[PDB]
Amino acid sequence: MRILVTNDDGIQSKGIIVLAELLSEEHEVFVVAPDKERSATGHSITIHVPLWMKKVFISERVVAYSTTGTPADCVKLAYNVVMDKRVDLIVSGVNRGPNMGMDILHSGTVSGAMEGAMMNIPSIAISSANYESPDFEGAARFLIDFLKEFDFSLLDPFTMLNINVPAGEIKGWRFTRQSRRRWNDYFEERVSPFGEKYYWMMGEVIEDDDRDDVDYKAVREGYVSITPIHPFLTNEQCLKKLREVYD
């Protein structure tokens, strides 16, 4: 299987290296990731200026390239220029920290995998749900096992898998829905040497989902959270109501 590995922390990140090396023992792995920190870049793409790539070494077992673009740019470039449109699976990660709730909208890790979903290529965004003490190997090992037990034909079109792995013990797998986890974010105001004020974004997490099958609850219980998501944001319930009211 020809696998494309990418991430949003940079090609030199420990999370992507372990993932690539472990996947290289059984598959043909191609790594195309950002040449710098791309966390919180969401699904941004580069259209105003050109993109550049650089061949880098990360293992004699894998073909690697860094690009001046975003995670989504990396997937487009890998697909069209590095892998000759021959990609069997796309894995974006392993990210240091969780990617759950509404945070996935600005997640670079998720965007990489989503670009794959948009092309109907089986894709997975994988994150170690513990920023402080991440377990890249455990997440990678879990993935290798998942690839042997999961049947990707069950994946509907334009659908990818957003995966969050507990850092401690993995007590099992659980298919979940995206939660509404978000933040009470504010700003820390400060003053620069030249007398101009500046702001630092800060925040406290909000976990107020009443539903029992959401992503963070599963992870909280030591269970890997596997959420099938697609690039469609329509609020059907609301749409139906707006119509039965006007038109």
Show binding-site residues for Mg(2+).
8-9, 39, 95
Interatomic CA distance for residues 122 and 153, integer angstroms: 9
Query: 225 with 142: CB under 8 angstroms?
Result: no
Q: Is 1 in the site for a copy of itself (CB under 8 A)?
A: no
Q: How far apart are CA 66 and CA 55, in angstroms?
A: 7
Q: Sign (positive/negative) of CA torsion 199, 201, 202, 206?
A: positive
- Asked if 84 touches a copy of itself (CB under 8 A), the answer is yes
Should residue 103 be labelled a site residue for Ca ion when binding is judged by CB under 5 A? no
CA distances for 25 relative to 28, 29, 84, angstroms: 8, 9, 22
Q: Do the bridges between strand 28-34 and strand 2-6 make them parallel or antiparallel, or are there none, so unpaired? A: parallel
Decide: is 117 part of the binding site for a copy of itself (CB under 8 A): no
Among 3, 19, 20, 39, binds Ca ion (CB under 5 A): 39
Answer with the entry of Ca ion, a copy of itself, none that 184 interacts with (C-beta below 5 to 8 A by kind): none
CA–CA separation, 109 and 6 (whole Å): 8
Q: Which of 60, 148, 153, 212 binds a copy of itself (CB under 8 A)?
A: 153
39 binds, among Ca ion, a copy of itself, none (CB under 5 to 8 A by kind): Ca ion
Instruction: Tell which one of 121, 218, 219, 229 touches a copy of itself (CB under 8 A).
Output: 121
Contacts with a copy of itself, residue ranges (CB under 8 A) = 84-86, 119-121, 151, 153-154, 157
